[PDB]
Design a protein around this nucleic acid. Structure first.
Ligand SMILES: NC[C@@H]1O[C@H](O[C@H]2[C@@H](O)[C@H](O[C@@H]3[C@@H](O)[C@H](N)C[C@H](N)[C@H]3O[C@H]3O[C@H](CO)[C@@H](O)[C@H](O)[C@H]3N)O[C@@H]2CO)[C@H](N)[C@@H](O)[C@@H]1O
Ligand SMILES: [Mg+2]
Ligand SMILES: [Mg+2]
Ligand SMILES: [Mg+2]
Ligand SMILES: [Mg+2]
Ligand SMILES: [Mg+2]
Ligand SMILES: [Mg+2]
Ligand SMILES: [Mg+2]
Ligand SMILES: [Mg+2]
Ligand SMILES: [Mg+2]
Ligand SMILES: [Mg+2]
Ligand SMILES: [Mg+2]
Ligand SMILES: [Mg+2]
Ligand SMILES: [Mg+2]
Ligand SMILES: [Mg+2]
Ligand SMILES: [Mg+2]
Ligand SMILES: [Mg+2]
Ligand SMILES: [Mg+2]
Ligand SMILES: [Mg+2]
Ligand SMILES: [Mg+2]
Ligand SMILES: [Mg+2]
Ligand SMILES: [Mg+2]
Ligand SMILES: [Mg+2]
Ligand SMILES: [Mg+2]
Ligand SMILES: [Mg+2]
Ligand SMILES: [Zn+2]
Ligand SMILES: [Zn+2]
Lengths: 217, 87, 81, 129, 206, 117, 96, 97, 25
RNA sequence: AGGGGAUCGAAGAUGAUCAGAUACCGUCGUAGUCUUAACCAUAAACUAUGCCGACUAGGGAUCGGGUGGUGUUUUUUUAAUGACCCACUCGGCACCUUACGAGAAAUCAAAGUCUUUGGGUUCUGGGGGGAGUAUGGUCGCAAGGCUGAAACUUAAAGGAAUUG
């Protein structure tokens, strides 16, 4: 087991919060890579890309490697992170660490009809890493994921079944394309539909419910 | 968010801003939630019983936080003769 | 300055604002009622006088026109309604 | 010169509510602003509005509840066939579930669904969601 | 709603007006305009001290409400009443930060300064703005002592005062600690004044 | 020149922190002290660590020094931070204001002890 | 803004202005100017028979070095002389 | 790309300023540009002021000053280091040294 | 070569080209 | 074309300079520079940033105008036209901070209100060359201006920023 150093890590390792949706709901800054490990077992990571980058020394050059990883399951918790390091598998490794500290909720949805376990997004959404806009459209069922294979993987682990996409910008810059689509799904829950017009009490923030077992021992 | 037969399908329902009624996202870590304490007769607040407010990253940043509380406080009742409705 | 009353704004701020900028544009000009140094006959004169108005007979100078409210002369009376 | 008068309005609405304000001062006031403002307020996307009488074309004050993403206008106001409302509604609306394309029929201002039941049509006007 | 007795307790009023917490800044900064009564000529804009008191009331009640007293952070770097935050902090759980903030304290779980409070309070929102930035990174709500000229960004409910030196700062923390000890705590007898001197919260010398 | 490196300072800084009461202003004793509570691979290195930590001492016996704190210092810190006045608001009978802040009293529905100017 | 007329009566100013700027498109230009029927050795057709004038080795460009083994050909339908490359290996021996 | 928002030095809403001649190069340069440092000197300077006030009549007298306003073009002003090169944000500050 | 001087260079070319064409009357 | 011609000063003449030095530097100096009448219609003619209308943010300096100052200062009502201070408000030449936003970035209160894509309207651009060339027309006394191709050639050219 891990050795929680943060106030959230307690409530996690203790067993007092069993779902991330609580950590999300109250906007809780998960600082510990092991936190999301527990909450989400079997969270699948795929390495998207590995490429070297070059600085200069006091004369010649510098070589190291950038790693692009996406972590999601199938159910709408996704993360994306980019780490660059000396070794390769060390960049991949620490890449998945940052990839998990990024994981994010997803508001899924139907197309025209609410029968049977939403297959698509809620609304249309878009997000832009500089110059690159990726835009998501609510396809119907059986349509599949219409998008470039680089994003289709992200939307798979995003738990998207059927979707439509439109992209404007430099698409061959990959690290900006995934970050663009990552802003996209990572929006839908910020898009306020009439479903969510419903008034809510402000649930009580377990940070102070478990305040006993929380604070430093 | 309902579903086919009326069976709730959704992973979580977020929290409206008390000031703007705008959703607070997961990465909204700019946002703040405030706990104001209920009292018995002659003060001495009750633990476990709070009056609660939510001020998102926007309002806090844009500079309406202190003012958007005094705005909010008087209505459920907190204070009197503080925040004007007219300038 | 987030939520306020546009319908019922204070006249403290609205009366230092611009004539067109009040919730309904008001005239900032008024109307006097004036006499001579020696005469009872009452002239009705506008607050901002482009013309130099006379009190009728004996051809007097009530006010000399300005880039604004007329500059009245020495002494005489006024009533703002 | 001021050429839409309605688009000048829905902008000021859309602007402030996206900056967090709850209230907006519109001017001048078209009766077409009012009918639009109606369908807005009755579908919830805005609050209640109070006409103001100048001796001029008049102002409005609209209370903003949040929850409104975008109110907008299509200028020019196109002629729209009935089968061509479906191809508009699929374009600018966020999803087939909710959202409103608001036209102007010979029956008068309404939304795209309210148009569909009556089986009328007319020129396009704007949108609300 | 608050019981009557919590009203400004007029004996406290002249303690304020003795500490000059009614003397505001020379510039307004419109987010502080509702906190002004009027402007004396020759440069001062007088703060409403009843709105001031009602803030300490609201300030306290939220400080109180925080379940564990130990993580409620009271920050001052200002030698003009940096001292008061040690006095406030012993009279409550309140881990103080007095002196340089060592940035990256709320972020950066490595550094020797790390914290995760549920509430943070600041003497001067300008010179302490370092932590105020870090607040909105970690979601932490914020209270502050805000002059009329002082930044409004990211501070949640906050208390107006002079903060041009000495008394007002200490006088408020002294009042804050007193009021948070009254609320819940062990003080009770809310009408009863504190034995503790307000000048205990005054930074000194030489 | 005579500048002492960080390994020395970062040691002497941490010695006075945990060892202050058992440390003196005498170098030659603190030398012998350094061989007990600490482990230093070479003789010459030890003398510099002692030589600065006594120089660090003679300033901390001359006043509070910035980089470090410890038990005995933080104690008289809490001790020496006490002193209240006899009375200070006293004040001299009423209170002096100029007219306006006084209207705030006649505003809030209070009386107090009013002296204007 | 948008710099272009949206008015409901503006069809002709639109229909025209595009027809005007289409000329900037290279592919469109060639179609109207009849570039192939005029300026091209082939008539705008996909192939041409011609007759070899002289066997021609040609030096290559940077950063390459080799002799490329082309020919000069006079198109029958045309008369326009054109130089064509002979591919693969030693096929120059196949044409005289 | 634009280095300065004064571009070389301040015009901001005029069409022209009748250019001035340099006091070193003679190089022409707009008056809105053209570094100008007014230079007043003692009529005497050095240690001259002592034995000059000695050698003079009049009681104690008083000392006149030469009044000159020199205009400089960039190329000269930089070479003669009336002005030097600054950093990206150092150039920004307009406060006189 | 300098933009400006390419301009002067062809401005001389167009003069000589007009002159040679002139001999065709 | 006349009038003018102080100065500066293309062409040029020289003295120096350099391997050379048709130059930079020095002395002189034609046209020019100045004007009147008539042409010419190009400039990095730049804010390299269309015009009209609305909307979204703080901050002090300032130019002009108006309103309120039982504010101030100089005379002989220490009252009167002035100037100064202070508060308000239009209309200006700029500036500062913040990014609410935007952008490839540099940066930008617009270069925002743009894939949640439409207030009105004018102009231009569509890889680099070839080339503002050729041709026709037109205007000019001319130098030239305006209009303005194609064949062919080529994988880069380019922007901003980063590290060297
Ligand atoms: N269009 C001008 C506007 O002026 C506004 O208001 C400015 C001025 O009109 C106002 O008046 C200032 C006064 O506050 C400050 N304490 C003294 C200053 N002299 C006054 O300014 C006044 O006097 C100066 C000359 O002294 C005149 O140039 C100016 O026209 C006049 N208003 O103070 C503001 C400056 O601090 C706003 N700054 C802004 O909307 C905009 O700049
Ligand atoms: Mg270096
Ligand atoms: Mg090549
Ligand atoms: Mg200039
Ligand atoms: Mg110019
Ligand atoms: Mg050019
Ligand atoms: Mg011919
Ligand atoms: Mg002559
Ligand atoms: Mg000469
Ligand atoms: Mg020569
Ligand atoms: Mg040679
Ligand atoms: Mg040679
Ligand atoms: Mg020679
Ligand atoms: Mg020779
Ligand atoms: Mg010469
Ligand atoms: Mg001649
Ligand atoms: Mg041009
Ligand atoms: Mg320029
Ligand atoms: Mg131009
Ligand atoms: Mg003025
Ligand atoms: Mg589309
Ligand atoms: Mg081209
Ligand atoms: Mg030409
Ligand atoms: Mg031609
Ligand atoms: Mg470059
Ligand atoms: Zn008369
Ligand atoms: Zn020069």
């Amino acid at each position: 087991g891990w050795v929680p150093v943060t106030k959230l890590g307690r409530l996690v390792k203790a067993g007092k919060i069993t779902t991330i949706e609580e950590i999300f709901l109250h906007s809780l800054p998960v600082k510990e890579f092991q936190i999301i490990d527990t909450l989400l077992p079997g969270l699948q990571d795929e390495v998207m890309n590995i490429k070297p980058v070059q600085k200069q020394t006091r004369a010649g050059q510098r070589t190291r490697f950038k790693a692009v990883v996406v972590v999601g399951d199938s159910n709408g918790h996704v993360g994306l992170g980019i780490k660059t390091a000396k070794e390769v598998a060390g960049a991949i490794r620490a890449g998945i660490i940052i990839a998990k500290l990024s994981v994010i909720p997803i508001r899924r949805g139907y197309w025209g009809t609410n029968l049977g376990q939403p297959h698509s997004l809620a609304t249309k959404t878009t997000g832009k890493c500089g110059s690159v806009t990726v835009r998501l459209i609510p396809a119907p069922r059986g349509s599949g994921i219409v998008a470039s294979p680089a994003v289709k993987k992200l939307l798979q682990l995003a738990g998207v079944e059927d979707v439509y996409t439109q992209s404007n910008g430099k698409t061959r810059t990959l690290e900006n394309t995934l970050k663009a689509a990552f802003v996209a799904i990572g929006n839908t829950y910020g898009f306020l539909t009439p479903n969510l017009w419903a008034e809510q009490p402000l649930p009580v923030s377990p940070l102070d419910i478990y305040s006993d077992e929380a604070s430093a021992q | 968010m309902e579903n086919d037969k009326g069976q709730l399908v959704e992973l979580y329902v977020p929290r409206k801003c008390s000031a703007t009624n705008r959703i607070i996202k997961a990465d909204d870590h700019a946002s703040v939630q405030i706990n104001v304490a209920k009292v018995d007769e002659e003060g001495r607040a009750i633990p476990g019983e709070y009056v609660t407010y939510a001020l998102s990253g926007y309002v806090r940043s844009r500079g309406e936080s202190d003012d958007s509380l005094n705005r909010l406080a008087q209505n459920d009742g907190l204070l009197k003769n503080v925040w004007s409705y007219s300038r | 300055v987030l939520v306020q009353d546009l319908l019922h704004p204070t006249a403290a701020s609205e009366a230092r604002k611009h004539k067109l900028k009040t919730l309904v544009q008001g005239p900032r000009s008024y109307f006097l009622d004036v006499k001579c140094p020696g005469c009872l006959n009452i002239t009705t004169v506008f607050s901002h006088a482009q013309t130099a108005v006379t009190c009728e007979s004996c051809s007097t100078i009530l006010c000399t026109p300005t880039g604004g409210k007329a500059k009245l002369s020495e002494g005489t009376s006024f009533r703002r309604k | 010169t001021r050429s839409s008068v309605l688009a000048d309005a829905l902008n000021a609405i859309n602007n402030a509510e996206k900056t967090g304000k709850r209230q907006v001062l519109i001017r001048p006031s078209s009766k077409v602003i009012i009918k639009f403002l109606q369908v807005m307020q009755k579908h919830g996307y805005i609050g209640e509005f109070e006409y103001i009488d100048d001796h001029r074309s008049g102002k409005i004050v609209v209370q903003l509840n949040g929850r409104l993403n975008k109110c907008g206008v299509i200028s020019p106001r196109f002629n729209v066939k009935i089968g061509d409302i479906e191809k508009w509604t699929a374009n600018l609306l966020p999803a087939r579930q909710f959202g409103y394309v608001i036209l102007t029929t010979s029956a008068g201002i309404m939304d795209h669904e309210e148009a569909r039941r009556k089986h009328v049509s007319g020129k396009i006007l704007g949108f609300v969601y | 709603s608050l019981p009557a007795t919590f009203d400004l307790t007029p004996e406290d009023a002249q303690l304020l007006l003795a500490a000059n917490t009614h003397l505001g800044a020379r510039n307004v900064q419109v987010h502080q305009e509702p906190y002004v009564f009027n402007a004396r000529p020759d440069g001062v804009h007088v703060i409403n001290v009843g709105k001031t008191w009602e803030k300490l009331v609201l300030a306290a009640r939220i400080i109180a409400a925080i379940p564990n007293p130990e993580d409620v952070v009271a920050i001052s770097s200002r030698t003009f009443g940096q001292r008061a935050v040690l006095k406030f902090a012993a009279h409550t759980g309140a881990t103080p930060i007095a002196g340089r903030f060592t940035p990256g304290s709320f972020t950066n779980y490595i550094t020797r300064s790390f914290k995760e409070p549920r509430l943070v309070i600041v003497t001067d929102p300008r010179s302490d703005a370092q932590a105020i930035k870090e607040a909105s990174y970690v979601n932490i709500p914020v209270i502050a002592l805000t002059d009329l000229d002082s930044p409004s960004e990211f501070v949640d409910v906050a208390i107006p005062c002079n903060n041009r030196g000495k008394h007002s700062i200490g006088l408020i923390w002294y009042l804050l600690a007193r009021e948070v000890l009254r609320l819940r705590g062990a003080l009770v007898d809310r009408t009863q004044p504190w034995s503790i001197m307000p000048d205990l919260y005054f930074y000194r010398d030489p | 020149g005579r500048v002492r490196t960080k390994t020395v300072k970062r040691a002497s800084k941490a010695l006075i922190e945990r060892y202050y009461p058992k440390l003196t202003l005498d170098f030659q004793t603190n030398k012998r002290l350094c061989d007990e509570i600490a482990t230093i691979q070479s003789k010459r290195l030890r003398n510099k660590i002692a030589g600065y930590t006594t120089h660090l001492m003679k300033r901390i016996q001359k006043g509070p020094v910035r980089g470090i704190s410890f038990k005995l210092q933080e104690e008289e810190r809490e001790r020496k931070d006490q002193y209240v006045p006899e009375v200070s608001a006293r004040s001299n009978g009423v209170l002096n204001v100029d007219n306006q802040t006084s209207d705030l009293v006649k505003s809030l529905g209070l009386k107090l002890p009013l002296s204007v100017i | 803004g948008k710099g272009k007329p949206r008015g409901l009566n503006s069809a002709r100013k639109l229909r025209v202005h595009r027809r005007n700027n289409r000329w900037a498109e290279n592919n469109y230009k060639k179609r109207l100017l009849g570039t192939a029927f005029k300026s091209s050795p082939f008539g705008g057709s996909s192939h041409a028979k011609g007759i070899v004038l002289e066997k021609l080795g040609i030096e290559s460009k940077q950063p390459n070095s080799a002799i490329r083994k082309c020919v000069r050909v006079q198109l029958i339908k045309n008369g326009k002389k054109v130089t064509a490359f002979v591919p693969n290996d030693g096929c120059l021996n196949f044409v005289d | 790309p634009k280095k300065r928002a004064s571009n070389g030095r301040n015009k901001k809403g005029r069409g022209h300023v009748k250019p001035v001649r340099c006091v070193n190069c003679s190089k022409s340069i707009p008056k809105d540009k053209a570094i100008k440092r007014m230079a007043i000197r003692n009529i005497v300077e050095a240690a001259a002021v002592r034995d000059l006030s000695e050698a003079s009549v009049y009681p104690e007298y008083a000392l006149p000053k030469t009044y000159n306003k020199l205009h400089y073009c960039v190329s000269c002003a930089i070479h003669a280091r009336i002005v030097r090169v600054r950093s990206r944000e150092d150039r920004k500050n307009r406060a006189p040294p | 070569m300098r933009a400006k001087w390419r301009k002067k260079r062809t401005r001389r070319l167009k003069r000589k080209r007009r002159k040679v064409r002139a001999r065709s009357k």
